[PDB]
């Protein structure tokens, strides 16, 4: 990565590499893996980002999809940012670390003005991972229904975990989806939640349905 001593390059740490490799091994593409990826890749050059992705041994279907998404974003970059003749303005393939050297990457990131090719590339990689998180979501939000004996808290945990993966974000267009939470609740709790009225907080809903599960 590029760190503060002056801004200097530092080798990717052995701890970081293992942390990323292990989180992929243990969590696969659960939605929380993305905030971990961005944090583990703090300050990364494009070279460092490519190293992290290449050290993943499994999930080669996802990694090929990721390569496709990166190529799409690189092509759109070139369309929006043509380059004319210290190297000149970055092309898509330079941002992805495919046609640029480490020294060139360091040069762009430390220029005034800075060309944050690592952060731009990190944006594209996350763009790809979001799609993968969505694809590897095992269940549709429409199929999350409260069990007959399931505590409301456990149902809500399942509901928002899935909602997070299918949206690939913790919150988006959720108003209509707060309607679904009530409709997909079990018969006993649903009646209680309906009586609660509009604008009820999750906190209020969980209190209302406490003990009802049993």
């Amino acid at each position, epitope marked *: 990565p590029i760190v503060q001593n002056q801004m200097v390059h530092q080798c990717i740490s052995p701890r970081t590499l293992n942390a990323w490799v292990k989180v992929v091994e243990e969590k696969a593409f659960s939605p929380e893996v993305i905030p971990m990826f961005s944090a583990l890749s703090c300050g990364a050059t494009p070279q460092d980002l490519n190293t992290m992705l290449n050290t993943v041994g499994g999930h080669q279907a996802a990694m090929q999809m990721l390569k496709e998404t990166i190529n799409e974003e690189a092509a759109e970059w070139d369309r929006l940012h043509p380059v004319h003749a210290q190297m000149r303005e970055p092309r898509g393939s330079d941002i992805a670390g495919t046609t640029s050297t480490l020294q060139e990457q360091i040069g762009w990131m430390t220029h005034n003005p800075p060309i944050p090719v690592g952060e731009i590339y990190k944006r594209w990689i996350i763009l790809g991972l979001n799609k993968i998180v969505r694809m590897y979501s095992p269940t549709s939000i429409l199929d999350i229904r409260q069990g007959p004996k399931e505590p409301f808290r456990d149902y809500v945990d399942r509901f928002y975990k899935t909602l997070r993966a299918e949206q690939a974000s913790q919150e988006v267009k959720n108003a209509a989806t707060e309607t679904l939470l009530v409709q997909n609740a079990n018969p006993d709790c649903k009646t209680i939640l309906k009586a*609660l*009225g509009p604008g009820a907080t999750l906190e209020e809903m969980m209190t209302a349905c406490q*003990g009802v599960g049993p």
Partner: nanobody, 113 residues
């Protein structure tokens, strides 16, 4: 098994005051939330007041300035106080309480000048 009964409804003048009260069987403190709704044909069921245990009272936008909802667990009954009455308030009022899945039969409140 579990009984709720509204009372306190009647015929009052506009701008008048009225206090509805909902009595519960068993201990009222065992319920985790209670509140007030109203219903009339074409006047689709409208929400009036809610209290969830440990939480602040929440009231509907059409009533916010004029009503108060309170629960007296000591007397085992809860109160809905209505002031500054409007014509749209004539309706039958129901309280709800819910443990494991309850409504009263309702009490009619009629507002006119």
């Amino acid at each position: 098994d579990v009984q709720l009964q509204e009372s306190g409804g009647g015929l009052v003048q506009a701008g008048g005051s009225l206090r509805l009260s909902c009595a519960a069987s068993g201990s009222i403190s065992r319920f985790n939330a209670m509140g007030w709704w109203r219903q009339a044909p074409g006047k689709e069921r409208e929400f009036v007041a809610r209290i969830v245990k440990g939480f602040d009272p929440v009231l509907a936008d059409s009533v916010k300035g004029r009503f108060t909802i309170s629960i007296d667990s000591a007397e085992n009954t809860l109160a809905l106080q209505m002031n500054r009455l409007k014509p749209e308030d004539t309706a039958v009022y129901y309280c709800f309480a819910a443990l494991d899945t309850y409504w009263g039969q309702g009490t009619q409140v009629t507002v006119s000048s």
